[PDB]
Design a protein around this ligand. Sequence first.
Ligand code: GQT
Ligand code: MG
Ligand code: MG
Ligand code: MG
Ligand code: MG
Ligand code: MG
Lengths: 204, 244, 241, 243, 228, 196, 240, 219
Amino acid sequence: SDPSSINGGIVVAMTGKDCVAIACDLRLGSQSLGVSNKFEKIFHYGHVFLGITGLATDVTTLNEMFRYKTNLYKLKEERAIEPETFTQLVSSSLYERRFGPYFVGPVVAGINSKSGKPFIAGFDLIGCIDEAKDFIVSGTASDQLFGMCESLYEPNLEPEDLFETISQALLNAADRDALSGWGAVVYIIKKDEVVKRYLKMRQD
Amino acid sequence: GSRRYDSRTTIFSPEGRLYQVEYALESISHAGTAIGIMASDGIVLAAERKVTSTLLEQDTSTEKLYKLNDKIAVAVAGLTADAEILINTARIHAQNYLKTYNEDIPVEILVRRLSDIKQGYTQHGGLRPFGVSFIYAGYDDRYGYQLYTSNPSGNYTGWKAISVGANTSAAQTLLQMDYKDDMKVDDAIELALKTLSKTTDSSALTYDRLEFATIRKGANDGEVYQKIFKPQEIKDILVKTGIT
Amino acid sequence: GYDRHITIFSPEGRLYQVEYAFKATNQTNINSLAVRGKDCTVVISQKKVPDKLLDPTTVSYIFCISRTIGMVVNGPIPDARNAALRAKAEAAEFRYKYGYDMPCDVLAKRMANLSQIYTQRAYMRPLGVILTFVSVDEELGPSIYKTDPAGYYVGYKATATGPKQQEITTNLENHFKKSKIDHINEESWEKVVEFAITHMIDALGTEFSKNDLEVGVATKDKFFTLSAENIEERLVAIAEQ
Amino acid sequence: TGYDLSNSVFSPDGRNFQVEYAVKAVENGTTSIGIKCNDGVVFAVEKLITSKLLVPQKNVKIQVVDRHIGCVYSGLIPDGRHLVNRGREEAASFKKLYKTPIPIPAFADRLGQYVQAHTLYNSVRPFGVSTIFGGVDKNGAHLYMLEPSGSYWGYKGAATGKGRQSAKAELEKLVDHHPEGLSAREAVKQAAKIIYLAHEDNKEKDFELEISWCSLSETNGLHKFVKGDLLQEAIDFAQKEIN
Amino acid sequence: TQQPIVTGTSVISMKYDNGVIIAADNLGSYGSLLRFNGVERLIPVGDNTVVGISGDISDMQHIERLLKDLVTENAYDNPLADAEEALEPSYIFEYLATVMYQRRSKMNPLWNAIIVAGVQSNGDQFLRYVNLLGVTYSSPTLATGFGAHMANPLLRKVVDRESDIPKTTVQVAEEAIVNAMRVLYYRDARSSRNFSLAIIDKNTGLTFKKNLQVENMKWDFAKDIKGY
Amino acid sequence: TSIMAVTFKDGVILGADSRTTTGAYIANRVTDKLTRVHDKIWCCRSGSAADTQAIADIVQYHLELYTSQYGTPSTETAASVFKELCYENKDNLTAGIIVAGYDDKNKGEVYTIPLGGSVHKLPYAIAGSGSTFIYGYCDKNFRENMSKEETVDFIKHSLSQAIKWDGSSGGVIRMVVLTAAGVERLIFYPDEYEQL
Amino acid sequence: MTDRYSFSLTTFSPSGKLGQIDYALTAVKQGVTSLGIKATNGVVIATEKKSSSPLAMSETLSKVSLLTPDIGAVYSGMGPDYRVLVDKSRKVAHTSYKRIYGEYPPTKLLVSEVAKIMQEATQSGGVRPFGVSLLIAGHDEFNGFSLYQVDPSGSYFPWKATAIGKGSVAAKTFLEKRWNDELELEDAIHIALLTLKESVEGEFNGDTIELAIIGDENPDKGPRFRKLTSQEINDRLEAL
Amino acid sequence: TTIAGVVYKDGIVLGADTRATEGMVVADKNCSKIHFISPNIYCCGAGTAADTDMTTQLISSNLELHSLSTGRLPRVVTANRMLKQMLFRYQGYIGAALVLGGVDVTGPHLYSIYPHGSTDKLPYVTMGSGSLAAMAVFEDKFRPDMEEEEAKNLVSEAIAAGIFNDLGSGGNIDLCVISKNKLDFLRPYTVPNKKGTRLGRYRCEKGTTAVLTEKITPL
Ligand SMILES: *[C@@H](CS(C)(=O)=O)[C@H](Cc1ccc(CN)cc1)NC(=O)[C@H](CO)NC(=O)[C@H](CC(C)C)NC(=O)[C@H](Cc1ccccc1)N=[N+]=[N-]
Ligand SMILES: [Mg+2]
Ligand SMILES: [Mg+2]
Ligand SMILES: [Mg+2]
Ligand SMILES: [Mg+2]
Ligand SMILES: [Mg+2]
């Protein structure tokens, strides 16, 4: 009965040369019992990508909530929300539930369409923004992901190289965690193309 | 007390009409004309801006045509400020439905709720009604393309072609004359512009006094696109049909 | 014509209740005046006690709002005291919330904002008063700010209010044309009080005993009113020159 | 016009006609007075004996607030009771927070602000009373008079009701003839005289006299009614002066 | 829910032929610390009633203000406030009993035990107890807290039943009360030597005695105690 | 904390140490526990720093608003406002406050308000964790109608001992003198008081 | 006290007119002239400081208000009504926008929020409409420079250039002739000073004119809103 | 976290480390902890990080509105009051531990604000897990009325003490110097640790990861 480790799962994001990557596993369980191997944790609102780990009901709820909020934004603003702005919206929304929080670990990823700059960010369950040049990690194998990213990562990787780095970071981290894995998805994001790849990984 | 200064906005006349609703409709009849035409492969929305000045910024302007979601738009006739209150309510209502059911809101459901809000202002609360008539243009996978209208009474109805605002009597006669069921979008575009051109209180219909939009399935395969026309695109479509 | 009974617009875009509240301002038949020194701000007002049965010490239109801010009112006493109690409460709350003494101009703006609400909301009448606030602000120095039933407010080099306000105003305008400066170039508040009384005498064309006047003085870190004997001392000094 | 049909409406003069109409109700009421003295205040009132069937001494009109303040009023009697009830609440909440009994000027503004509040809205009616009140606090004696507009001042002597002008004239003579001061026991006797003299303006029905006082030396700074030997002595003093 | 901080100990009392006697010491304890040595815990209401209070002193001071405020309120529009419509002991008690029970029922009690002693209009002796739970009872002798255990046994030897009240004079009753206060000072660790006593008689009225002391103290036998 | 207030011939003096702790760490060694609620009404604060600071601020606000309407409040009135806050919020407060002020009618006055929110008017008062160690001393050495110099010495010697034995007390001894003459602030350093 | 005015004080008349809105617009007509002009690299807004008395310090009365660092406002009509709209405009820019998105609202949306507040005074119980027309000039990253007018009804329109209040009919004609799409900011200030001279009766200088610009950043960003000084106006009046 | 501040001759010097932690893990090595309140007032933050960011942002917003209305620069005492009164109302549940420093019309002022709503007004303060290490430096070397470059060095030295000796603190040293004539926001002031150099290249070559399916979509 620790809300952030009932269902399991992980998300990681990285930056490269004029690109960003965000990846997640596919497991949803109930403690020891694996229930679903199709539960994606990465969503998008226009060109801004959001990954969410933690309690799966809150993952779903928050996706629905940010879709709602970014739809209204776009109608009023007459433009797509940018990553820097969305990051602030996520923070505000989480801190609104300060003493009854959503049990989640969200990760923002995307390229600002005006400046061309790759952007990633992470949050705690209560809204504190963690910005990074390099990588953001989240979920039940966050320790494992921190270790993988800190040793594998280098700056300014080409999209094809960055794919290999982020995939190896996720896979090897997931295999040292009982509650993560069961399939994986990687998103490679360039200024005006996005490539989504499913990874082959061990299914135990 | 304050009884002295109460207009009693929600009462019946001896004839069984609602004073304030009737007077709001009289207000709307002086607003710029807006026309909706439903074709088999799309919908046209056309509206005449209220007497323009040459120093008005035309491109960054919105007065008549508003987007409610990706599948539904409205043409406005009446007080713009009143319309914006209602538009935001409608926009939120659409998003509530999407959040609840994970499906885009069916057009009639949205129209009914907006119309129900208007009705309330005529039965309780002692406030003036909204001085607005809407043309709703939209698509859903149940009924396909749909046109509706609502007015300050909260009454709504569905149409193949319809006008609101000024000179609706003349506009409706002209639409009734040239409309047919097998019509295409590009024909409907022409009918809309021709009708406004004849009913207008201006000397000649020009690009700078018009707002124009289409809702087509003319994207790529089985999906709906909203095109709010830019100034230059209205200038081109006005030349293409030989009005200017 | 119910547009003259509540605060809604007439066909010519006017608010008659606001206009009539301005006429209530002069109902007391009292004239006030405010000027600034180098170090101080002096306010003076006429004191008329017609009834012999009145306790003259309790008849006042000058209020000590806070330690630093004083306020003179032109208008009926019930509305005047309503304005005063609110101003006191507002200035106390400001100090609690924000940790420093409410400036004269900020209080003025606040009371003007309250007045504005009564000109827009129907259930509340305007107060038939004009409020003149005085202090020596720690940032802006000697300050005079004035509020009316319209919700208007502005700062002043000097000012006057009442039935015979225009006479006093032009008298002051003519002095500042001559002196070429924004204030009374004087060291002591005692002489700025003397200037204020002297120029009121000239403009109104009347002489004053000690009981015909009321005087408030603002200095750095306190506002205070003068006793009958303080004013008498001041009247003697004018007469001996 | 119509400016007089609704409370809180300014006329084109800048007047609130509804308040002025409340003043008419006060002018119609019986005479009440207040006399400030050396170390206190004295209150008196005319009680019209409508019928033989009224129990004497048993329809008391002067009212105490806290233990040190006395209130008397002319006009609509129920409106006066409503004002005193509020006064009692205001005095209670002052003593609750600040411990000390409410000072008289403080108490005066509590009534003043409350009465003024009933001229701010058309959903209330102004008070149909003028109230004479006062007592003894840490700074000595204070006498006040409060009117339907919310206007109040401190007084040496005060009068309201049908015989106010007669009583005012009589009060002004006392102020002129006693510049040093009047004693509490003297002021009681004078109060009786003035009510008897002010009764000439209401002389169809004969009346009953009611007096109260607060004095630092005579009542120990507390409000007390004048009864028995001291009352009959004050009545006899008044009877001698009318003849 | 709270906890009592500054506290008063026993209040003791009894009936006699013409009236009642009540007494209490002048100490405000702060746990084991004997903090305040000048606290009056007998509070008179008019000239016919004395309310003796034990327990929390902050709550006692609150009750003191309620009684003071009750006297003010009774005087309002009451020409007979010093005569037929004066406050009776039975009125004052019932008010306090109502308050005490209301407060326990909101789970926010006044942390006290109270004895209301007085004489009524018709000369009848009034003596009744109420506490933080709203529990009430009357008896020829009443005592709170510690006094219930030590004072009552001594006082009941003077008045054991109702029929002993007419046989008990004011001298015998006052001796018994003062004697009981001595016994409490020997044996109660949270008591003091200094106390107040109040007699309410139907003939002689209210007599309030301050700055009394326990005297005639037997300590001599202490010198002959050697070890355990 | 060791705080006290003592009435004397010309008025009243308040005294306090300057130590604030979290367990055994001294968070502030130069604390001011003597705080102004009016020109000549001051208080000594003990208990929770946050609670006493919040109370003192509310009281200062109340007395400022009192002054605006009714002029200078009595010391009794100030104590009553403290009591009202302490008593009604007893369940959520840890505040032991001594209130001390100078009137011209009443001269020097001391009111102590312990944890329950009771009020006690006394010739002098001691409070705080360090007060326990000086009850014996203060009772033996206090006299009524002392001079200014005697009262300063009485407070200095007393708080010196309270500081010596209480670990929660220390730093400097601050004092505030309240008389008809005005308000005087005194400070005494370790090198003076420790060797008394 | 019961606020019993729970009903609308603005209602439709038989002709379809909303009386109180029209009457509010008449109040705007009586008010002092103010204008706004949009250049390629900036926007200018201007008005006359109509001093109620020469003893009054007209510097203290600011007709031109900063709403956000990149947005400014000016009005014609009732000053107190404007002052409370500026207070609400500033507050709504923080509560409903900056505390959510971590940036200031774009000009069009802040305008939309002010417009909403004014609409509600036109429909809610027991209130009259606001007796002001606003001219709001501003800049934001995605829309660039813009200028908007807001009326008592709550209706708002974007403008290349316009005027409101006393001499607005004459001033709008003057601007139609002079305005083009290749104006620099200095050229627009020059045209603003020319247009405003027509409607002013008395003294015409930096102490009687209030003029602000939305332009380049003045050293995260610097603020684009700048209020011109009394000296800066007088310098441009010599090259007039 | 190690945050600190001193009052020097001309004004205020604030200081902070840059380590953000998630339990025992470092989530950000160069995280900013000195927050903007107003142009003349800044606020170092310790305790719960979200509470620190949101509390300083809210009070910065409310002070901006206050300053627009009054037309004058805000004071530190009002920043202090607004933070204090809010934190008190939430009875410690908002875990914000702030070092508030700025320069008024009344001169330079420095405060420490605690989660429960207590404040101390002091010439030097330290907060966070590294407060004892930092306070040792101040007790060793602090004197009143220091020159600018001396006060800078003392704060830097006090943050360094926290960086090296406290495990909760680390990374770079950020300073903020506030006086009447200037505001100097120095980030980073010092880089006391070089980033550890890696001896091998562990990055995988292209095609190494096993893919199931791919999808490309343009924007
Ligand atoms: C040092 C303060 S300390 C260790 O001495 O108490 C920093 C101060 C700080 C860093 C960054 C910022 C950003 N502007 C402001 C202040 N504090 C931290 O590193 C804290 C450690 O307590 N870290 C956090 O609060 C982190 C934020 C990280 C994502 C970057 N959040 C958590 O650890 C949350 C806390 C929490 C809150 C409510 C309920 C449960 C847990 N843990 N989680 N999940
Ligand atoms: Mg696994
Ligand atoms: Mg398995
Ligand atoms: Mg009104
Ligand atoms: Mg020690
Ligand atoms: Mg607490």
